[PDB]
């Protein structure tokens, strides 16, 4: 038995839409120009604060609280940057060439060049947003994909715990297919689109690995102080 495994597709979508974290604002003072340090401070300040909402969103993902506390920690430690990043990419969908970190903090690729080595990350994120736009990614699909990432990215690194997760992952797949059927796609187009959406997760993993190394590079260069929570999420990827 469980709880998530008895959800219909509509209920899965409804649950995911309801769990959604709010779009946070940055403390950015728009009257002052950026420095490398101010940019980093703004971005890490924002990310730290999103982390708190994410943890509370994760507990609202059907089947996530069924896992032990230490498995919950493990999945979040692994997927956190992937989760922030897909979030960013989703928010920036309707802003070609721009990254909407916050409503009051919308940056162009040239502003990625404020922080050393940051523009390379920006370009990958911008490319992913462009791709979301090409597919006309839907919000219902987005929430499915983000829950998939949470449950998938660390599941091999764990087995009833792992078989349970795979049952939940199959329900999310059903939910994604359900939405496509509901949108009037043919069987063949549903299969195709599913593949297209899930292959995006491979690029998002890539961006996370690269962003993790950049963030660690920025921690050694000690341009800005990071919060303990951010430090611990980062250190979970070291070694």
């Amino acid at each position: 038995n469980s709880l998530a495994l008895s959800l219909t597709a509509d209920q899965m979508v409804s649950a995911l839409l309801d769990a959604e974290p709010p779009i946070l604002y940055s403390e950015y003072d728009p009257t002052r120009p950026f420095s490398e340090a101010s940019m980093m401070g703004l971005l890490t300040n924002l990310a730290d604060r999103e982390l708190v909402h994410m943890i509370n969103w994760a507990k609202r993902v059907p089947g996530f609280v069924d896992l032990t506390l230490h498995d919950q920690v493990h999945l979040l430690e692994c997927a956190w940057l992937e989760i922030l990043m897909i979030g960013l990419v989703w928010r920036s969908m309707e802003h070609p060439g721009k990254l909407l970190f916050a409503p009051n903090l919308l940056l162009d690729r040239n502003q990625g060049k404020c922080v050393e080595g940051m523009v390379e990350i920006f370009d990958m994120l911008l490319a992913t947003s462009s791709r979301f736009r090409m597919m006309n990614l839907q919000g219902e699909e987005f929430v499915c994909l983000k829950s998939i990432i949470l449950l998938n990215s660390g599941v091999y690194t764990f087995l009833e715990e792992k078989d349970h997760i795979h049952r939940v992952l199959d329900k999310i797949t059903d939910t994604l297919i359900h939405l496509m059927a509901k949108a009037g796609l043919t069987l063949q187009q549903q299969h195709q689109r599913l593949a297209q959406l899930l292959l995006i997760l491979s690029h998002i993993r890539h961006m996370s690995n690269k962003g993790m190394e950049h963030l660690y590079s920025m921690k050694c260069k000690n341009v800005v102080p990071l919060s303990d929570l951010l430090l611990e999420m980062l250190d979970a990827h070291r070694l």
Partner: peptide, 10 residues
Amino acid sequence: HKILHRLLQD
């Protein structure tokens, strides 16, 4: 006493 640990419990 990992912060994530505490945030998940609470």
